[PDB]
């Protein structure tokens, strides 16, 4: 899976992955980093700032990193219209947040 | 990969896939259908309406099916602000279009 949609979360150790060799992981040291074949190409730089962190994408578009005590360790603070959004790790290696919802098949949830 | 971003396309035979057992395929008969373990749970119902079809998600949010002669076989007609959008096949089995872009890492393209 290379997407995380509102209001889902990426708990400690969880990651999104897409070809050719990309992995976006929520590490145990609270550092949210993007790997390219073993090379860190991007990171929230919050390594060591918390324990049991999770990356939550809220329904308003705000992407937040919370520690085990629910403290806001990091956030893009891009919260707007209360709807549904998605975090996408792309094959072009860019990680993007899109929203709100424009259309759906209704085949889910 | 379980995502298709503007203005990319899913040519004949191509598909998105996500767990547990979901596959969104652009078939050769031009029918755009969602499969759940081999069971069709959703479709554009355009099977047999064209040849060499492709599913294109434009930068304005409009998702269109074109035959080999560029004829508009099907469309969600959800075109709005010219930006960048994404079509996501979700683990909850719903297929959603999100946009515009809210944030990106800049780690790509």
Superfamily of A1-109 according to CATH: Bulb-type lectin domain (2.90.10.10)
Phi, psi of A106 (to 5 degrees): 80, 10
- Whether B3 and A88 lie within 8 Å, measured CB to CB: yes
Any bridge partners for residue A39, and if so which?
Answer: A36
Residue A83 CA to residue A72 CA, distance in Å, equals: 21
3-class DSSP assignment, residue B42: strand
Q: Exposed, middle or buried, B77 (CB in 10 Å: 0-12/13-18/19+)? A: exposed
| Contact across the interface for B96 and A1, Cβ inside 8 Å | no
Question: How many angstroms from the chain centroid is the CA of residue A58?
Answer: 10
Chain A: nearest CA to B8, how far in angstroms? 11
B107 touches chain A (CB under 8 A): yes
Distance from CA of A71 to the nearest CA of B (A): 22
Q: Using a CB–CB cutoff of 8 Å, tell me whether A94 touches chain B.
A: yes
Q: CA A70 → CA A56, A57, A65, A78, distances in Å?
A: 11, 14, 9, 19
How far is it, in rounded angstroms, from Cα A84 to Cα B7?
A: 21
Tell me the backbone φ, ψ of residue A15, rounded to 5 degrees: -155, 165
What does the DSSP assignment read for A26-44? E-TTS-EEEEETTEEEEE-
| Two structure tokens written together for B55 | 């599913």
Asked whether A102 and B85 are in contact (CB, 8 A), the reply is: yes
Q: Is A66 helix (H, G, I), strand (E, B) or coil?
A: strand
**How many other C-beta atoms lie within 10 A of the C-beta of residue B23?**
16
Residue B49 Ramachandran class (φ > 0 left, ψ -120 to 50 alpha, else beta): alpha
Strand segments (E) across chain A:
3-5, 9-10, 15-18, 22-26, 32-36, 39-43, 54-57, 63-66, 72-75, 86-89, 95-98, 101-104
Task: Please tell me whether residue B38 adopts helix, strand or coil conformation.
Answer: coil
Terminal Cα-to-Cα distance of chain A (whole angstroms): 16
What tokens were used for A84? 């549904």
Nearest to A104 among B96, B101, B102 (CB): B96
- For this experimental structure, what is the resolution in angstroms? 2.0
CB atoms within 10 A of CB B74: 20
Token duo for residue B59: 């930068």
- Residue B2 CA to residue B19 CA, distance in Å, equals 9
Beta bridge partners, B40, equal B35
């Amino acid at each position: 899976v290379n997407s995380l949609s509102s209001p889902n979360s990426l708990f400690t150790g969880h990651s999104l992955e897409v070809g050719p060799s990309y992995r976006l992981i929520m590490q145990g040291d609270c550092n949210f980093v993007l790997y390219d074949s073993g090379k860190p190409v991007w990171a929230s730089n919050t390594g060591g700032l918390g324990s049991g962190c999770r990356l939550t994408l809220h329904n308003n578009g705000n992407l937040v990193i919370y520690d085990q005590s629910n403290r806001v360790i990091w956030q893009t603070k891009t919260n707007g219209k209360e709807d549904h959004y998605v975090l996408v790790l792309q094959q072009d290696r860019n990680v993007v947040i899109y929203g709100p919802v424009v259309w759906a098949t209704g085949s889910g949830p």
